[PDB]
Scaffold this active site. Structure first.
Site, PDB file in Angstrom:
ATOM      1  N   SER B  27       0.750  -1.255   0.000  1.00 14.06           N
ATOM      2  CA  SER B  27       0.000   0.000   0.000  1.00 14.06           C
ATOM      3  C   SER B  27       0.784   1.312   0.000  1.00 14.06           C
ATOM      4  O   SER B  27       0.184   2.383  -0.022  1.00 14.06           O
ATOM      5  CB  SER B  27      -0.928   0.017   1.212  1.00 14.06           C
ATOM      6  OG  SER B  27      -0.161  -0.039   2.408  1.00 14.06           O
ATOM      7  N   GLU B  55      10.300   2.258   2.351  1.00 10.84           N
ATOM      8  CA  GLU B  55      11.637   2.838   2.467  1.00 10.84           C
ATOM      9  C   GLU B  55      12.725   1.787   2.619  1.00 10.84           C
ATOM     10  O   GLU B  55      13.806   1.916   2.043  1.00 10.84           O
ATOM     11  CB  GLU B  55      11.719   3.809   3.651  1.00 10.84           C
ATOM     12  CG  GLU B  55      10.933   5.107   3.463  1.00 10.84           C
ATOM     13  CD  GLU B  55       9.534   5.040   4.036  1.00 10.84           C
ATOM     14  OE1 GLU B  55       8.910   3.965   3.958  1.00 10.84           O
ATOM     15  OE2 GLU B  55       9.054   6.072   4.551  1.00 10.84           O
ATOM     16  N   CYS B  87       7.984   6.236   9.126  1.00 13.22           N
ATOM     17  CA  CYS B  87       7.644   5.815  10.479  1.00 13.22           C
ATOM     18  C   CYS B  87       8.901   5.781  11.339  1.00 13.22           C
ATOM     19  O   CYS B  87      10.022   5.890  10.833  1.00 13.22           O
ATOM     20  CB  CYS B  87       6.990   4.427  10.474  1.00 13.22           C
ATOM     21  SG  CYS B  87       8.132   3.033  10.354  1.00 13.22           S
ATOM     22  N   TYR B 125      18.565   7.783  19.342  1.00 11.10           N
ATOM     23  CA  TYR B 125      19.365   6.676  19.855  1.00 11.10           C
ATOM     24  C   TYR B 125      20.458   6.291  18.855  1.00 11.10           C
ATOM     25  O   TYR B 125      20.265   6.533  17.645  1.00 11.10           O
ATOM     26  CB  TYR B 125      18.464   5.463  20.109  1.00 11.10           C
ATOM     27  CG  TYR B 125      19.220   4.179  20.359  1.00 11.10           C
ATOM     28  CD1 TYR B 125      19.904   3.969  21.556  1.00 11.10           C
ATOM     29  CD2 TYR B 125      19.283   3.187  19.379  1.00 11.10           C
ATOM     30  CE1 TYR B 125      20.633   2.802  21.772  1.00 11.10           C
ATOM     31  CE2 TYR B 125      20.010   2.020  19.583  1.00 11.10           C
ATOM     32  CZ  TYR B 125      20.684   1.833  20.780  1.00 11.10           C
ATOM     33  OH  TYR B 125      21.401   0.676  20.984  1.00 11.10           O
TER      34      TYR B 125
HETATM   35  C1  LIG Z   1      17.592   0.351  21.787  1.00  8.85           C
HETATM   36 AS1  LIG Z   1      16.244   1.160  23.007  1.00  8.85          AS
HETATM   37  C2  LIG Z   1      17.225   2.730  23.665  1.00  8.85           C
HETATM   38  O1  LIG Z   1      14.945   1.723  21.871  1.00  8.85           O
HETATM   39  O2  LIG Z   1      15.796   0.094  24.349  1.00  8.85           O
HETATM   40  C1  LIG Z   2       5.369   6.144   5.710  1.00 12.57           C
HETATM   41 AS1  LIG Z   2       6.113   4.344   6.100  1.00 12.57          AS
HETATM   42  C2  LIG Z   2       4.540   3.404   6.812  1.00 12.57           C
HETATM   43  O1  LIG Z   2       6.437   3.694   4.438  1.00 12.57           O
HETATM   44  O2  LIG Z   2       7.453   4.354   7.265  1.00 12.57           O
HETATM   45 ZN   LIG Z   3       8.454   2.749   8.053  1.00 10.29          ZN
END
Ligand SMILES: C[As](C)(=O)[O-]
Ligand SMILES: C[As](C)(=O)[O-]
Ligand SMILES: [Zn+2]
Ligand SMILES: C[As](C)(=O)[O-]
Ligand SMILES: C[As](C)(=O)[O-]
Ligand SMILES: [Zn+2]
Ligand SMILES: [Zn+2]
Ligand SMILES: [Zn+2]
Lengths: 125, 125, 125, 125
Positions: B27, B55, B87, B125
């Site tokens: 999608s 992506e 995302c 992170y």
């Molecule tokens: C790798 As983590 C900082 O999202 O627990």
């Molecule tokens: C906008 As997406 C759901 O391809 O990370």
């Molecule tokens: Zn994504």
């Protein structure tokens, strides 16, 4: 052994992985055959959050081409590692998205063989 | 406010998703631009175990072509949904594998704009 | 400016990671606070297919106890690394499942601060 | 047939999922037995980026308690669905982190039985 079309997948995947620089992020290539006869390739994207295995990148590449059903797939590791059996996650995705697909793996004799995905996931979810 | 190359990415991704059968599994489409000027596309593979977003399929497609560093990326949803911000998982992978990449998102005024990946992951992170 | 309960999350996660053998598979602990006053902990499970981060194990642990809406969460790394900002994937899962949650991160002065999850995912998907 | 500890795991996992509100996000519970005399539970966290299955939440819960080795595990679906076989991704993580573990699944007769993880992932990766 496997058919020539299936054997072609091994050659294509091998060519793909050996054609790119050695990397720990991109270390495996995959090739799948669509029901219409086209072949789609791709390499994995390693990441701790679950970067896609080469097979999943292939599924996305095929989908982008409206390839429809995929009938056979294989994964080839870099550094002349040859055929690699699909991991558990890939087996699940393949079963759910292409239940009629077969994966190429090495038998006890270490020789290439195409197996129905369900056989790689007994009593599968 | 986008460069010619960035606008092309939007057009390429839009054409990709609009070109395939409407599906709940495939999608979203994405397109990325590499430093050497090449464009790579792909669509997502939905799966509860973490099937790759469009992506990520693009990252593996680019890697399969030894594209090297990617400078910009965008995602377009099916059914004329237009630009979708990457995302959280994609932002993390993009940050870790292509730290100098930008992602096209809609700004507070609804206008497309290319933003550095770090801006999408404050205190990342 | 962390509340008493928020600072307690830090203590609990820190105690958890300092209570298990040093491991490359289990290297981060997390603790979250429920609106009902209960605290839930967890440790990550590293795996290339996307083993859950400590935060996601916490979400599943809270769910198993019918905790409801979580209001704050924090991740503490082993090797005495201290507070770790949630990765991009965790941010997305937290935003989608507990949109009102806050995550404890380090400010410019390295001091613990609770930030709304939406602030950690600007123009979030 | 199932041993005492195996039937107990089914009961604990069943009680866990049936003790929380019906949800599309938290729909499966799991329970595992450790070699040091403890039982750990957990519920899945559904998310398109690969939220953990109940089994992975259990692995992180066991890890948080320094449980060491898990010898048996089972998953129970909500809405009286009973025993659910571990999905492909879980099988891979289980094989890689607890190779000596057994998983409870339904045989061809619909009868529960504990099977070695390797048996659920033929010629695994
Ligand atoms: C790798 As983590 C900082 O999202 O627990
Ligand atoms: C906008 As997406 C759901 O391809 O990370
Ligand atoms: Zn994504
Ligand atoms: C053999 As694989 C890790 O590409 O599923
Ligand atoms: C049956 As399951 C989705 O908890 O691997
Ligand atoms: Zn795989
Ligand atoms: Zn994370
Ligand atoms: Zn699973």
């Amino acid at each position: 052994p496997l058919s020539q079309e299936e054997s072609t997948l091994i050659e294509r995947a091998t060519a793909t992985i050996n054609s790119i620089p050695i990397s720990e992020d991109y270390s495996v290539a995959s090739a799948a055959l669509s029901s219409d006869g086209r072949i789609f390739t791709g390499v994995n994207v390693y990441h701790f959050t679950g970067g896609p295995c080469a097979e999943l990148v292939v599924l996305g590449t095929a989908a982008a081409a409206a390839a429809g059903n995929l009938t056979c797939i294989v994964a080839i590791g870099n550094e002349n590692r040859g055929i690699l059996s699909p991991c558990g996650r890939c087996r699940q995705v393949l079963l759910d998205l292409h239940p009629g697909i077969k994966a190429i793996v090495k038998d006890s004799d270490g020789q290439p063989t195409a197996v129905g995905i369900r056989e790689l996931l007994p009593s599968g979810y």
